[PDB]
């Protein structure tokens, strides 16, 4: 149980008409190492618009999950992105008010504002990038560690206290890379991924070669239980968390275009998803990192559903310790979770995780057809909180 | 209303406040805490909750601190150092409010929530700001500049004038001067034994800060009328009708009503309800205007039932808007002055105002039954807490 809970009930009124993401690239030496943050968010914001033939001035609100950027750089990067995607002055751009989070509430608060009648159309997005445009509108490594070190140490304790073994954690990372490799090789990410045309600087020569990034570069198809069992602990001398069974910061962006069911209908826009419910929960401080394990039952219950009704989960894999705990504690069927791989394989783009997982969930549900009716997206909001979202498959 | 969403915590009569204190608040711009490190502001307030209750430090189940100015990991290390010096052991976990920008009221609310949930019996909701650093202006601006730009816009749209904003700053300095002169802050304030470098000679002269050094008793409508707009050419907001960043700390000791009873501890206050709300994006910075009705309604009360209001004065534009929108009795609000006079210690505002409220409720007698503390959680949210007078 939780200390408190925010619940948003959206009924049938709030649909998703588009949900997309950039590829995710490892922040340390990945294919976005010479790509600025606004050049990740802008093409995802722009695709929502192009895919729905929507006038950008019709969007009532853009809320962005963004963590790495310090202070005023958060908003300025998003406004840079918004401006360059063609949004006018009159479209307000906001950030998620958290020191550390994974961005899901951005999607939920946009949904809530639509349900409240504040506006008809909104974008819930997310963005992270280790790079800084020298051109600002009108540090970052510290910020990554500041969020992730506490998350890692707490989860290695929760795992240590509930007996989540090194094998169990490593098996999760193996499964993640297996599933991400298989989804990539089957072209299952093609619908959700907006390829990013950019440049890659050859460290040897300094030459900038044009590159179009289309694939998640963090995937390691050769990952085995054997390769991972060789890896050394990252936090404490006899700890079970390694570089292999935890996720690394990746550059990327995600965005979800939400609207009132009746406006999508007058516009002739297929429904990709129906946002049913959102719950954010404050957890017992005695056992932090376990966010999702508390928020999932909360959001499912608010949807008038039982855990067994959920066909697919997207549960963030920031650390296998915490991922395996939350899965095991809830008794979830492992075969319904991160079916196309998780952050251990494709990466952890902090504040973009929420929109990223929304895109993955909805497009897989689309793909799996009518019997894939209900989906949950879940993740932490920093060590003390969980967030979970219930989605119903759109009719298209 | 209306909120886009609401978090409601209902505490019953289960969660009592047995002590609430604050340091004096001093101007960050070369006020009397300019040579005092953050941990040296929080430590003696945390220690005062302990000393005044004869509590063993290790009995505290949780310490949650609102702190804004500090960058990233420094937020945590400042609070943990302050906790160490207040005599708390490793075993007492110290957490910070997970917000980029907030006034820290939710620290108190979350501890109360955790007590009501039976997670522990005793916790501390606290806040700390200091511009000094123990071997931040950018972080302060990031929070307040958009807050003021937005609140001014709301003022200009809904007819909150320069004249009415300036009057509110006069009123704030006047009430705070009367309060200070009348000894009304003595109960809540923990004086800070510190050292001060004299700017003229450079000498370290040891000092006990007891007074909020930012009160300007000479503040008139004439003196405020002469100040230039801080945001745009024809803007209404000035350096005089908004609050300045201030160094200080606040801490609130909460516990289960039965453990306080067993312990022989006088109840200062009863935490009844808390609400936090996301507001209409088209009108940002009006937080308290949505959150007060919500928290009041959660307590099963009406606005008329509330005897005292502590509403944050980060900007007069926003404060006057919230008061006028709700039709509150101006005479029940910030009765001992507000942040325009005594300072805006960002994340320490929550605990600060709770202490001011409860002590004034106690002083006023049994008829001062209901109090509301309200403030923003950044431009997009509002927080409000309902308290009932302790016996």
Swiss-Prot record, chain B:
Gene name of the record: PED1
Keyword Acyltransferase among record annotations: yes
Lineage: Eukaryota, Viridiplantae, Streptophyta, Embryophyta, Tracheophyta
Description of how the protein assembles with itself and partners: Forms homodimers.
Pathway: Lipid metabolism; fatty acid metabolism
Disulfide pairings: 101-143
Keywords of the record: Acyltransferase, Disulfide bond, Fatty acid biosynthesis, Fatty acid metabolism, Glyoxysome, Lipid biosynthesis, Lipid metabolism, Oxylipin biosynthesis, Peroxisome, Transferase, Transit peptide
Main location: other
Note: Plants silencing PDE1/KAT2 are defective in the wound-induced synthesis of jasmonate and exhibit delayed senescence both in natural and dark-induced processes.
Organism of provenance: Arabidopsis thaliana (Mouse-ear cress)
Subcellular location: Peroxisome; Glyoxysome
Free-text function comment from the UniProt entry: Involved in long chain fatty-acid beta-oxidation prior to gluconeogenesis during germination and subsequent seedling growth. Confers sensitivity to 2,4-dichlorophenoxybutiric acid (2,4-DB). Required for local and systemic induction of jasmonic acid (JA) biosynthesis after wounding. Seems to be involved in JA biosynthesis during senescence. May be involved in the positive regulation of abscisic acid-activated signaling pathway.
Stated family: Belongs to the thiolase-like superfamily. Thiolase family.
Listed Pfam families: Thiolase_C, Thiolase_N
Matches recorded under SUPFAM superfamilies: Thiolase-like
Expression across tissues: Accumulates in etiolated cotyledons and in seedlings, also present in roots, flowers and siliques (at protein level). High levels in wounded leaves.
GO biological process: fatty acid beta-oxidation; glyoxysome organization; jasmonic acid biosynthetic process; oxylipin biosynthetic process; positive regulation of abscisic acid-activated signaling pathway; response to wounding
Catalysed conversion reaction: an acyl-CoA + acetyl-CoA = a 3-oxoacyl-CoA + CoA
Catalytic residue list: 101, 344, 376
The protein's name: 3-ketoacyl-CoA thiolase 2, peroxisomal
């Amino acid at each position: 149980s939780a200390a408190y809970q925010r619940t948003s009930l959206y009924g049938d009124d709030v649909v998703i008409v588009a949900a997309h993401r950039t590829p995710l690239c490892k922040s340390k030496r990945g294919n976005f190492k010479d790509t600025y943050p606004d050049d990740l968010l802008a093409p995802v914001l722009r695709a929502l618009i192009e895919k729905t033939n929507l006038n950008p001035s019709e969007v009532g609100d853009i809320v962005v999950g963004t963590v790495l950027a310090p202070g005023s750089q958060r908003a300025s990067e998003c406004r840079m992105a918004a401006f360059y995607a063609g949004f006018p002055e009159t479209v307000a751009v906001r950030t998620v008010n958290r020191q550390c989070s994974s961005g899901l509430q951005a999607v939920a608060d946009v949904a809530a504002a639509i349900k409240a009648g504040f506006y008809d159309i909104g974008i819930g997005a997310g963005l992270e990038s280790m790079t800084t445009n020298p051109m600002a509108w009108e540090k970052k490594f510290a910020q990554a560690q500041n969020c992730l070190l506490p998350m890692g140490v707490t989860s290695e304790n929760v795992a240590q206290r509930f007996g989540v073994s090194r094998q169990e954690q490593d098996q999760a990372a193996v499964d993640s890379h297996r599933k991400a490799a298989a989804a990539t090789a089957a072209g299952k990410f093609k619908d959700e991924i907006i390829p990013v045309k950019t440049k890659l600087v050859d460290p040897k020569t300094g030459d900038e070669k044009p590159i179009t990034v289309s694939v998640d570069d963090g995937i390691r198809p050769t990952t085995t239980l054997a390769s991972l069992g060789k890896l050394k602990p990252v936090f404490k001398k006899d700890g079970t968390t390694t570089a292999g069974n935890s996720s690394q910061v990746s550059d990327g962006a995600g965005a979800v275009l939400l609207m009132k069911r009746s406006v999508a209908m007058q516009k002739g826009l297929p429904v990709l998803g129906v946002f049913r419910t959102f719950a954010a929960v404050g957890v017992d401080p005695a056992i932090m990192g376990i966010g999702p394990a508390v928020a999932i039952p909360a959001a499912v219950k608010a949807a008038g559903l039982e855990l067994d009704d959920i066909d697919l989960f997207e549960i963030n894999e920031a650390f296998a310790s915490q991922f395996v705990y939350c899965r095991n504690k809830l008794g979830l069927d492992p075969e319904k979770i991160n079916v196309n791989g998780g952050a251990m394989a494709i990466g952890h783009p902090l504040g973009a995780t929420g929109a990223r997982c929304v895109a993955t969930l909805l497009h897989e549900m689309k793909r799996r057809g009518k019997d894939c009716r209900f989906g949950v997206v879940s993740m932490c909001i920093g060590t003390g909180m969980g967030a979970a979202a219930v989605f119903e498959r759109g009719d298209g």
